[PDB]
């Protein structure tokens, strides 16, 4: 901890941060109560 | 019930005053005087009456009664609280900062009448609201002061320079004598002399010593009119401010340690009595912006 | 117009979580909640010394649960740690005796809510006392601006050796006689004495 | 012109390009920081 | 006659008017809303008596306001003629017990008529359950007694404002019409020497364009308005002319982006104002507008007309022109002047009836929209009133009001006075009104109009100071919504026994005298000089026969709560306010005792409060018992009253009800048969009266702390029951059903010792923290046994089972004897919410005795925490050996400016020991002899009305003549002080001490509720810091000023642990607990979690917040 | 939340681990090793009997008997008083 | 037998500063605390209480007693 | 002098007494920046707030380089503006206006050096004031040889 550099986040940086891509608005199936595939909360 | 003894002369003085008041009302009924002039003369008349009855009560009460013992000692209370407990309350503020023409003539021992109680509540509720708002404003002021005053820590033992600040050690010197300043404590005490002082060819107060009662008294007796006290304003320190310029801390009585957060303490001290202030103009006087 | 969502209230936003009185900056980074703490109404204790504060048995026991458990395990009052926890939860006499033994020579920082100036937090020597209200020395009251109409004062526990060192040396109640505003006594109130 | 110079020079000296103004990919908060926690009673609790 | 127990009266003036029904405000408003038998009986009684009253009820008025819906063809119509009720299916106790809203059905006859069919079809429809109000002014919704508080608002009408602008150096005037429902309008004059109009404040515009857009022509405009030069200047500077041009101009300014259309603009102007639906001005709005503008009998109900707009324009210029008296347009001469909004003639209370009516109105408007859509999407001959009307909006709005609304407030049943004061409060905060942020100095401040219409003394002392206030004692509500107060009539200087009710505006014109003014033996005034009050709150006197009204009772200005305090006149306003706020928290005790000294009005407050159980028939009691009392009227009807016994109130206090009447005593209608909480013989009793001596005492009573005997703990003088209610629900989850059983898993055998057969704690089983109340077990869970657990189980051969304990346990720090348990089973006939198979509630009741820390207070704003309870012998005792039950610091009364408590103490002493005055021939003796309070036996209570109390001469003279208690000697010296022997050291105190009896109350700020502690407990989810509150083991907050104060000390390490180790660091907390337990030194703190949350969030706004080191990347 | 590791449970489990390891060390080296493998006190996956009987060089049944003897010895009142309180 | 039992003036003049005294007594308290919890390794570098100690004691109290006695010395690196 | 006297007489009107150093430190904080004028040789903008130290350093640099110094006039601004216009954006961000500072800091791409207090309370590190200083915290402890000789 010496300096908290801040700046504009370019598209390349946001892609680098991401561990995947979100393609659906699904959150959790109404029965199994588990996170869905490729949506929000996806494991 | 017998501890609070209302002055005996009160009834006679107040009936004399009300006789004069009804004379003025009679001479107003004929139009000889404008209503505003009536209000002004009446307000002055009743201010004089309440001051005089306060003096009469102050003379009346003995030194041995409990209220005198617990007000004179500094235990609690104030003389005006006893004034409105024993003597008549006096003029009370009307809503939106006005004054009533018929001030409360009764003390809390005798008991206020109905309209008197109502017109007192008029000011009481305003006082409570003012207290709440002043508390909030003081809190916000303290936050702002603490934020702007952060990052100023003592990070040097002694300053690299010698420049100082001129302060009035003694003022209001009557003819043929020297009188010290009335508020010498908050200004020059707990400060640090930048350089020695010589008045009779001999050093009186050495350099870099804290000022107390004995030193200030001796310097005033020697007759010096000013003094050059080192202060943070003129401090020339490469890193923050030095301990020497700031002078002794006030909670310890000793030279401020290196690394002490002086800015936070300064902001807290400034903002602490913000709730206690609660001062406001008694009356606008009918003029805005003056 | 904002994105009202349900219609009752505007929705929270990424920037809204980073802004305002309830934002992260001023509510979860500069002022945080803390474990090992307590709160209770305050009563006046005149028989105390300037460096003492009375902690009810329940509050003292709950604050010092780890230390009480360690002392119980060391003195063989409880067989193992879990038995010690069961015993302290039950609240037997030996638990309170161990508590009386363990609290001593360990400072606790009494603190009132407004904390206008640095004397708002003052370390004290705890002392077990019956009842459920904190006993506080009348002299140090006026520094807290703490009357006894009805008032709650938070008690915080310095854990590390450094923390209790500071509380013993710096934040002590007896080393703060003078008010920092103008360097005059503040630890000699005037109501009764 | 003073304000324009201030911002233009601030962008010139910094290595980051001005195109960061127009984002192309929107980051997503980690799910635990926007919890859809199970709540007793068959109900649910969600962040906006 | 026998209404109330005897109470010696010190009042000096007789009261013509008796105090009205203290709860009329709620019950009569709801009767009007319902339009039941009571409201129409009242209406016809007023009509035959000549008194005005609205002849149309609330529900029927709102139904009739909705005209039959007409489609685009106008062929069809629905008529809602008559509405009716049926008796409620659930009894009040039944609804309270089983969690049902106390409601009744409401039907209405809908008639279907179509011109094309030429037939009329009638059919009754039912719109849902209507939440009904019990006779005691409370809505029992979902088992919880709610109360709807009246709301202060600005009544609709015109309001003119005068202001000064520093830049302009001249006065600025503005006008505003405030509608009841529609969009608002303002008319500013000489903003910059020209007059303008604010049409929704959309854009800058002149007055000339508006007038031209109307049919009024320029010639007649200047003819009428040619006498004022300013508006002539406005006219001539206006270049545009012609109605069409002005209309299209204003339309373009209002709705730019499209070309102007004549018909569309005219329809828009008609819609925004002249439409009767959008601009529905209430009856009060028209009523006050016709008076203010002076128009003589305009349309009784309707929208503003062009005549009204021109009249307002005229009035505005007359006010600006400086003329103070001018002819009103189409009206008589009227004073033109600026009006202040805060005047109580401009403030209107929305009683419960009007609030519920507004909610019903919006529900019915939604219903009308839905049915109109259905007509637009339905075929003829298949349309009937049953199928078309959708009842969801009405029920869902009247249900969304009583829940989730500021005005429908949770009842506080701390005591009957708290209930009354909650009923009578006028909450200015709420929807469509003065909010907390919108508060200013003026609104909170008292006004001269608040005299008999609002109590100035009592109000919340918190941030909402003055915004909420209790209605005056004698206040009554105008049908329009204003507040009246009674006044006695005066004619040729003779006071008549006739009463007229005056509102806030009718009062201004006349001159009102003061009730405390003396009167002669004859009905004429004794003294020519009489104090009066006049317009503007002036207090100038007017001697002789000049007044016309005077106050009927000196306690008009004080509400019910403030009127309780004795010797209120001697107390400061601030302390009186604090005492009034404090009296609404005294808890009922095991045994209640009525005050020895107090107002004469506690009986009315107690009886009008619903807690007391009074008889409805004049009969003889036949069976008296603890559970119930039976009475038999002479007619033959038998009625038995069931007395509630130890049932939890809203705040968690017992509501035990005692019994007074004997077996064979006679009863009169309305007589009190059973007390309630904080009551005795029908008299309010919020506390016990303790012998008090004023002295500092070894520092225990320092800074208002209180010292009291161990007698109070020993004799249960100050002891109260406190019943807690916590419940669990055996819900059904995905894995399986949770089971309430005695076979709890992973437990010992002795924990489940007192449980019943099905796993419920028995009745009467004392519990403590951790004791099992009801045993419940989770269905199952995916259990992956850990290696250590596996080995331990195998060694011990115990089978860990999927079922997991979730039993209810008493929260930490609790004790009490269980008194009752209730079970509701799904499979049984009982109904439950979805999912919950079984629900169990357990009542745990404890007899909390007074102890150190518990808050105590008196009536006069003197409050303190108990600091020590010395034994009976340590108390400084009196000469006869009677210890003083409480020591109070003398330092308080002079500084607090509340010497009324000293007067109360002296009068309590005088009441305790009777007095005998006969033939003394003294002035005070004469006053007592004519009053009748001359011979008083020991112990009898005394009544000192709030502003007609006992004069100090009376108290002194009585103290001279107290009955000799023992050995023919009086213990209290003439000065009111007595000899006090020190209990501990023994020697007498050097000087006498003031002693007497004070009425002390036990507040609800008990130390048991406040005490909270936390080694380590639950943590929050989104941020890993500890969560707050006491119910969830919450750590205290270390605010910003705390960290500032710690920085001021320079203590960095204590801060570092107080921010990292003790919260917000997940890795650090387990490590520090482990180190403390193992004795190892505390480990180095890590980084906090909230900082990680912050950096992750700011990374989500496209700000690449990178933590870097001096030498390249940093290690974290 | 439910995921937060209760410090009381964590420290109790660590003390349980220490006590269990010490009690196993009290037993003979081979016996402690085989029972630990049978119950995965070193690794999260316990090895069934014949799977213990590969690295140690003993049969699927010899390992069974010595595991049974270890269980019997641990069930002795000696090495049970400390572990009983931990459940 | 109290927190004030070692008066602050002697320690302060021994260490010449107040924060320095806090940190130095804290370091010594940590050292004695980690000594008392050795439980058998017997590292040569660790040093136990120089002054006499009770059967149950706080490490910081013994550290401050050592500072007051003066037999302990410090040296900034 | 004017500021100190005004605020002191405001406080003394009621009866409270605050020492003058507490005011003086804040008054020095307000007067810290200087408005630059005639920014010819210094090459930066004219008429914007600049810290005294930065102005002195730039003047020394330019006079050493031979260019005539850029003039400046002292400027007094309220505490709020002074706090907002601080080098550490992580402290200004913690202050009242979070959004604006974050936008301008991001555009400027300024790295927040952790010197200061409010930023070191956020990170959870040790504040550099009091026991958290470097000089106090680097000391090592060991008894004397005679103490070991005795025991
Ligand atoms: Mg308080
Ligand atoms: Zn310096």
Curated annotation (Swiss-Prot), chain A:
Regions that span the bilayer: none
Subunit description: The RNAP catalytic core consists of 2 alpha, 1 beta, 1 beta' and 1 omega subunit. When a sigma factor is associated with the core the holoenzyme is formed, which can initiate transcription.
Stated family: Belongs to the RNA polymerase beta' chain family.
Role: DNA-dependent RNA polymerase catalyzes the transcription of DNA into RNA using the four ribonucleoside triphosphates as substrates.
Protein name in UniProt: DNA-directed RNA polymerase subunit beta'
Organism field: Streptomyces coelicolor (strain ATCC BAA-471 / A3(2) / M145)
Region of the whole protein represented: 7 to 49 of 1299
Curated annotation (Swiss-Prot), chain C:
Full-protein positions shown: 389 to 581 of 1299
Quaternary data: The RNAP catalytic core consists of 2 alpha, 1 beta, 1 beta' and 1 omega subunit. When a sigma factor is associated with the core the holoenzyme is formed, which can initiate transcription.
Binding annotation for Mg(2+): 147, 149, 151
Function: DNA-dependent RNA polymerase catalyzes the transcription of DNA into RNA using the four ribonucleoside triphosphates as substrates.
Annotated gene: rpoC
Name of this protein: DNA-directed RNA polymerase subunit beta'
Family membership: Belongs to the RNA polymerase beta' chain family.
Region spans: Disordered: 1-17
From Swiss-Prot, chain F:
Segments crossing the lipid bilayer: none
Superkingdom in the source lineage: Bacteria
Region (Sigma-70 factor domain-4): 23-76
Annotated DNA-binding residue span(s): 49-68
Subunit structure: Homotrimer (Potential). interacts transiently with the RNA polymerase core complex. Interacts with RNA polymerase-binding protein RbpA via its sigma-2 region (residues 211-347) in a free form.
Family: Belongs to the sigma-70 factor family.
Described function: Sigma factors are initiation factors that promote the attachment of RNA polymerase to specific initiation sites and are then released. This sigma factor is the primary sigma factor during exponential growth. Its activity is stimulated by RbpA.
Protein name: RNA polymerase principal sigma factor HrdB
Curated annotation (Swiss-Prot), chain G:
UniProt key word DNA damage: no
GO CC annotations on file: cytosolic DNA-directed RNA polymerase complex
Top-level enzyme category: transferase
SUPFAM superfamilies documented for this protein: RPB6/omega subunit-like
Reactions catalysed: RNA(n) + a ribonucleoside 5'-triphosphate = RNA(n+1) + diphosphate
Matches recorded under InterPro entries: DNA-dir_RNA_pol_omega, Pol_omega/Rpo6/RPB6, RPB6/omega-like_sf
Short name of one Pfam family: RNA_pol_Rpb6
GO biological process, one term: DNA-templated transcription initiation
GO MF term set: bacterial-type RNA polymerase core enzyme binding; DNA binding; DNA-directed RNA polymerase activity
Domain of life: Bacteria
EC number from the UniProt entry: 2.7.7.6
Keywords for the protein's UniProt record, in alphabetical order: DNA-directed RNA polymerase, Nucleotidyltransferase, Transcription, Transferase
NCBIfam families associated with the record: rpoZ (TIGR00690)
Family recorded in the similarity comment: Belongs to the RNA polymerase subunit omega family.
SUBUNIT field: The RNAP catalytic core consists of 2 alpha, 1 beta, 1 beta' and 1 omega subunit. When a sigma factor is associated with the core the holoenzyme is formed, which can initiate transcription.
PANTHER family xrefs: DNA-DIRECTED RNA POLYMERASE SUBUNIT OMEGA
Function: Promotes RNA polymerase assembly. Latches the N- and C-terminal regions of the beta' subunit thereby facilitating its interaction with the beta and alpha subunits.
Protein name as it appears in the record: DNA-directed RNA polymerase subunit omega
